Each structure stands twice: as structure tokens, then as C-alpha cells.
Amino acid sequence: DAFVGTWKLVSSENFDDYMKELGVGFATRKMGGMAKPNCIISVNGDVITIKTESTLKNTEISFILGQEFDEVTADDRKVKSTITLDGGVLVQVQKWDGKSTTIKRKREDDKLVVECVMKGVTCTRVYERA
Numbered sequence: 001d002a003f004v005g006t007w008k009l010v011s012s013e014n015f016d017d018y019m020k021e022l023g024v025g026f027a028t029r030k031m032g033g034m035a036k037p038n039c040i041i042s043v044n045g046d047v048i049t050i051k052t053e054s055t056l057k058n059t060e061i062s063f064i065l066g067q068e069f070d071e072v073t074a075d076d077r078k079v080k081s082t083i084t085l086d087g088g089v090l091v092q093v094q095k096w097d098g099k100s101t102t103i104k105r106k107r108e109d110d111k112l113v114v115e116c117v118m119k120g121v122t123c124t125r126v127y128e129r130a
């Protein structure tokens with residue numbers, strides 16, 4: 001849709017702090033911190049796929065809007081994820097061990113803007129089309 005495409009990370013703010021708030025240790029934060037992933041979003045029927053690709057780590061999820069799914073995150077959390085589309089924003093929540101984190105993806109001008117919140121920490125990541 002508005003989201004379908006291949007997107008390259010061009011800026012990131014507070015990602016280390018976000019990872020730390022998730023309880024990510026040093027080695028894994030080091031890997032995530034200066035990574036500049038591509039995110040490839042595609043849709044087929046009811047099923048959206050989001051692939052994230054980087055030199056040291058790749059992940060992929062496929063999901064139906066509103067349908068909870070099991071996910072293993074890049075930092076090896078085992079989470080229950082639900083993704084809905086609200087006012088043009090793809091809203092993802094991940095729930096695990098009585099915690100939650102949200103990942104909101106929106107389109108703004110030429111940007112795919114990704115807001116990641118854990119407790120009091122808010123990270124903003126910006127991607128542009130490859």
C-alpha cells in the first residue's frame with residue numbers, strides 16, 4: 001500500500017536507550033546500534049510481510065491485521081504481537097513477561113517514520129525508499 005516498498009534506514013534517535021529499556025545486553029545493542037537495515041514491506045491478500053535485512057541480522061514477520069501471532073524478536077525475546085492499522089498508522093504491540101512495547105509505523109512526506117516506545121523511552125527511526 002502506502003507502506004509497500006524497500007526502505008533504507010537514514011536516521012535513528014534514542015535506539016540504544018530503547019534497547020537498554022528492553023533489557024538488551026551490550027553485544028546485542030552494539031550490533032543493533034549502528035546497523036542501517038533495509039525494511040521490505042509487501043502485501044498478498046490478507047497477509048502483510050515485513051522483512052528487515054542487515055549485515056549481522058535479518059528478521060521477518062508475516063501477519064494478518066488484528067490477529068495475534070508469536071514472534072521472536074531480533075534480540076531473542078519471545079513475544080505475542082498484534083498489528084492493526086489505525087488512521088493510516090501501522091500499530092504493533094509486543095507483549096511478554098507482563099511488559100509491552102509499541103512500534104508505530106507511519107508514512108510522512110518521503111519518510112517511513114517508526115516510533116518505538118518502551119516505558120519512558122521513545123525512539124524515532126526514519127527510512128527512505130531505496
Ligand SMILES: CO[C@@H](C(=O)O)c1cccc(OCc2ccccc2Cl)c1OCc1ccccc1Cl
Nearest residue numbers: 019028032035037052054057058059074075114125
Ligand atoms: C523491524 O523494524 C525496525 C524499525 O522499524 O526500525 C525495528 C523496530 C523495533 C525494534 C527493532 O529492533 C530491535 C533490535 C534490533 C537489534 C538488536 C536489539 C533490538 Cl531490541 C527494529 O529493527 C530491527 C533491526 C534493527 C537493526 C538490525 C536488525 C534488525 Cl532486524
